[model samples]
Target: GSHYKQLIKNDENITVNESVPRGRILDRNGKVLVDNASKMSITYTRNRKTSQKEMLNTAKKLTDLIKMDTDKITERDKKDFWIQMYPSSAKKLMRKEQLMLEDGSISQDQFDTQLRDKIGKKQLKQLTKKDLQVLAIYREMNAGSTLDPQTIKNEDVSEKEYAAVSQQLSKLPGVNTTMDWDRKYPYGDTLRGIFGDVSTSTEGIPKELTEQYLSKGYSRNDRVGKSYLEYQYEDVLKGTKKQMKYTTDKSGRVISSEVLNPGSRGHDLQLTIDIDLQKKVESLLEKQISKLRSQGAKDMDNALMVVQNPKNGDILAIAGKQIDKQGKLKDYDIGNFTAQYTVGSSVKGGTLLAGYQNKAINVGETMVDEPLKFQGGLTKRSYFNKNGHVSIDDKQALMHSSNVYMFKTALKLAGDPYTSGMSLPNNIADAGRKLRKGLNQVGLGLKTGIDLPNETPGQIEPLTNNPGNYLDLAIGQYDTYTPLQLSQYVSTIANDGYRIQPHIGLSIYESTNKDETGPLKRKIKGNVLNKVNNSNDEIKEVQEGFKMAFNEKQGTGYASFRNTVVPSAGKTGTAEVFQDGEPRVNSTYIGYAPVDDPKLSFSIVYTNQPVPPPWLNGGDLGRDVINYYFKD
Candidate 1:
């Protein structure tokens, strides 16, 4: 009867766990941007009271399998054997020296000198690189969290490697085998800046998010997103982890378990990114820049292009090229759009609009593009004045890119103009301030307010006591703006004077396969920020000017855009800058297509090409890019 009594209790706890697949990020066409696949991994958990000696023993065993990542540590530092020792062991090993200093038996400098004297410099020089690898593995073991299990190796583990670890499971206490999700990029490093990165579990939650994550049942050693989109949407993209109740005997042998929560997959992101178009744009920019490079254009290494839908402000593709530290041209980081720089004459359209708003100029008014000489010998000249004075209307002003025309507008806004007697107004108002205010109303010198964090609002400088500063501001100098801001400005003009909020987020899908997760949920609507302060007639005049710039043989962009099928309007700009007292030029282009009712607005900026510049203008690259978009 006693033997028949209940020998075990079902309430006793055992190990219980669950794993949910993290969500995948997709493009508008459902192509994977970010996804996860399991890789063979081996990890070791530490018992609360496991001695430091046991950790050393385990590390020694696993050293044969996992190689460490410490290639560039100082040679002398790597030679220190104590670096690979367990923290407690290393402490004990250094105790004699530490205590000697504590007891005042040895001075700090003497202690350091003694160690250096004991270690021969020749010994460090003689050590092979393999020795450093061993030290790396040892350091990792030493640095691992004491309470949680650490991944010994989680990358691609060979079948033989798996077998080796599996066979030793029984002998290696706390050793465990598991599959970890390995991040895969279908398009390779194409948009790595925006795709972002995730930290390993060993690195754990960021110090800033540590407490917040602990409340959500994240282990102290849980992995986390580290930057860009990965960090911005960590909560949305992170899967719901399972909670479980374990039933095991008092002796700690697992007897039974029950799943408390099955958990759910993280939601997916559907971006407005057109991967094919993005690749094409980046390639075209690189190719054109390469052509310029071969033509003896030095320092002309970087370019940024942003293409957006004027109707709803959806970003289609943002592509750029930057010279990385290693002298290789890589995909321009996301900062390319957010970083601000002086944009030159690409913003002349804004000045024209301001002129109209202030009643300073008429759409049909003709201005002779002749050099103006102010009092005190201050002369303002048109770039075209070199050839001869050209008579142009407001539309022709843009087509001709007449600095004289814009300078006259700048003077009119300030309520002052140079007289034939060369007399100037005694008191001149800050026309630069007024121009910037008008530009801001149309989305310049401001943030586009995209979902990404840390967007720069750009920099705008006020006109000084001098009236000439107003002329500089009118042509997009003495102020800076992000490429995003410039794109929004052009898009506002394209959308018939209504400025819409720009966004890259298109929708949020539930799963990779449409059938499994059902229809996508978050269809971001077209958000209109403001109806710009301009009349349709006024905006129409500027639009005509841009179209004229493309279609007319005398226009600036005509040479580059003449062959394109789609009717487009564009403006080209090249600003001279002094960087570290060395001359540089920033070439830029801004445009939109189907001039009757614009759909796409784009901006490209190629910063800092050498003098004499390239034979082609920024509009040339824009023409080919637009041609590709309408190719099908």
Candidate 2:
């Protein structure tokens, strides 16, 4: 008994972890994209030995000083609050049988469950809105562990309310006023989709990630990055938390406290994205999509674009927009790398490289771009020349986007060159593999190794004996690729066969203040995954084709790119697709500007467009975007 008394009187040291403001996110030029906005907050920290009655009384008093949002309070909260406020009234609501169970007929757990059921909707309705407001504070006060500060009114707290609560802290036990930080976006929703979000203190760490965070010494109430860039760079952005140690008596009354660690804010991130260019691109997308909708391209609802520095794989801008059935326009910026589409002949450059690598065709090799009628399949020909044959070399094939040429190349790669009315071999999976392997080297139908998470590696159609599908694969119709993958592909060609990993994070810096960027801590360099297997001569042949495709009058992309202020090389694509059981088209384009000394590489995808209407071509969008990029 004496030892027990001594143990009870001993002082204990309790550690409390407090939140620190997260770091800011900036653009390449130090323009703040996301920053912290500090605000006054009314918070509560329950003492370990405090009674529920004391907490209820404190909550009731706090309601008069500061208002709380009562919409989140539930019926359970009302009943709990009512029971705490009126224990005698609560006991009377229990039936005689429940009373007997508590008196020892059933387990205490059983009796407690029965008592909770006794409180009905009628009892809940007795609590008014003002009463519910008290319940909101009461619920929050009891939500987390004792000694951990919980926010009561942090959002839009008025100065009057804060002052009123601050003056009454001595009377209200466990009540304190502190400054809290909230994320603010200066540019609004420009790249909000990619910037992502942070969890609230109440949200804490995500449920699925709770264990992961707890292992890292995170408290249950610590705010954390929830998704996307916020999530990808969590370690860099989640600041070191402030830690305090409190000395308390055995009765849980605090005697002394000292700061253990004042902590510091997280490091800031400088992204490769140019906010000005991003805004311009976003506006351009909205205008072009709106124009397409007004012009009769009724089915066109979504578009994605990506612009990058080909030489270094720096992603300068990623823009996407969607027009819903309600005709509402919204940002789909994440779709630049997450969503995939059949990119049509925009991938013909990769296809030509594949043909060269597989020895199915040689550099500048000529083929007869005539109608090819398979024994039991449909006839395929160039889009411009459907009835007559045109003898075209590698450059001319890409200039005209010859389906027959790609089909013959596919057949030759499969070790079965086309003959008059000859049927395809039974199995052509090897042919599909060869084409995909080549495209993968050029960053198509494969992951582009972008720094962002959850990037789709595009879709590869299941291999089958269908030789027609193989032909489609050569022209970018059988499989799909994300707009980001297309950007990487074009960048690879522009970089002369080196496939560089695309990245958004340009550098990380220490934050001097909430708004100022400090010295660089780290610089993110472009990672080169691998160089294309094709020889430089082979790749250059396709490069020449892309140049002619944009510069020559008969080329498919000529109308859109020929008059540009800066000379460019590009390819246009139109993939036949079906959405909601209706046939549609996906117009796409891939290009690089200042062809002789490439600097910018880009890709555009406009999905589910109408067939008859003068469709919004990707080339036209590319032209406008490229021109704006080089504007004075």
Candidate 3:
């Protein structure tokens, strides 16, 4: 009784309007692929518990309202409360309906009024007194509250149906339909884990965002991206909400009310994704993996597929298998190979591009790629394109994935840096460092600043004077980068050294940052695009190289590029996956197409698979990807 006045003072019909954010998961087309859908749960909050037998019988009677599936009821009512269960993780919490029903106080009519929906009204009028008692208790518990609106909303109900439910359900103590934006993926199961899921964990949703951040303009309620792009760009995607304060006179008289803090909305995401194209790629991937499994050729430990815009540097599609066999998609386990590898023959383009930028290497220049046996201090190995006596030029070196050719050319380019006006290093240390600087320009050694969260930077071991190390580095055997990062470097080259960061976000969110004018977008950029103009000659040269890899009759990627309407270019690599000493698996191929007016780029990799049978080739995948984009 002493605190009664305090409760009243705190009251005054506190109206808090939480403008919930839409879920972060969207279709690749920048559409709301995922959004909140209603979860229908009939409540008994203001009623009493029915006997298990009676409850079952009542449940059957309710089947008159709809179709009654006893099995469905059992699924929904499996917990002790018998009214709040789900298909999965339903144990997390009991719905208000279930809690009221288990206490044995309310009746069907009261339950319907407190929440919504019921069987016959005439049958409800016959409640046996105990039902009314249950209603009284529920009334006392929730006098003037806003918590009555459960996650369930009116989206599932029609305007007419909602009007009817509102009329019926508003009579009980305190129950109302609440609305919030929810994320949904239209193409379920395809890009599950990489897309990330939502969570209500306190740890996941920061408290600062709930209070200070919310006041600035964020929602205290919507779950921001807990995974994937949501997690990655939270500051730019979440939105703002407004605070409404209610007022009343001291003698419980009604007074004026006003809005306190205005909240902002979440950002819209725009991805480089072609939803239809993504669909096609995933379908083929699944079929291929399934076929391999059936043939004992499946090395499903992990697999990845990539697609992008070579001209704009947009990552169109990225996918990997969960590998856990749980039949659910997960983000990790399959190495995000695109983002994490030595970059093999794929990086050869980088080496060649750098030289071209410095005016040292030329597409027309002839080069040797015969096998070489070289001796340095201790580590010595023979480099070859493949097991054969073969001669090659720049075009052939790339097509055949010739380590022999790249090593010799890279070494020469390494020495030529000083003469080309580069701030050439005095020793191999300085030279490698300067080379890495260009790598940084291409956005290697860092996350691509993508729309996805949990991205990690690529890493390269210190370049050593040790001959083997240089050889490996020359052939992209010792560095690693994520698929996004890899795409960036290649696309940066294609974009004429004008690379933009890969992102799936559509619009920057203002509320996410807590300021009024909503979030402003940052133009994703890489080192190359920062200083050089898009029309720079070096960029053209790089494009020519990519083109040379495909269109030139003897271009390394020529086999795959031949006979395509748009000029196509690419590079092929087949590296022996090595352990401490012995070789274990095999890795091959990365490429892009429409070489002259670059459009989409793609990379496909198969790890640990033997090279001979149904052998995986980058050229073949490039063909598939090119064919996909161009149509028959």
Instruction: For each candidate in the order shown, give its overall lDDT on alpha carbons.
Output: 0.73, 0.84, 0.51
Candidate 3 structure, TM-score to reference: 0.67
Between candidates 1 and 2, which one is better according to lDDT? 2
Best by TM-score: 2
lDDT tens digits, residue span 362-432, model 1: 87789888878776777777775655778889899888888889888877888875454364554455566
List candidate 3 segments past 4 Å from native: 1-15, 20-31, 46-181, 200-222, 232-239, 259-268, 290-297, 322-339, 355-367, 376-392, 413-427, 507-528, 531-545, 551-560, 578-588, 612-615
Determine which window of 10 residues in candidate 3 has minimal summed lDDT: 1-10
Per-residue C-alpha lDDT of model 3 across residues 459-526, encoded as one tens digit per residue: 76776564346556666676666656666766776656666666554443233432232344544432
Candidate no. 1 TM-score: 0.77
Summing lDDT over every window of 10 consecutive residues in candidate 1, give the lowest-scoring window.
1-10
Per-model TM-score, in order, reads 0.77, 0.81, 0.67
Candidate 2 structure quality by residue, lDDT tens digits, 544-567:
999999999888888889977799
Model 2: CA > 4 A from native: 1-13, 43-154, 159-164, 171-178, 244-261, 612-615
RMSD of each: 9.2, 8.1, 11.3
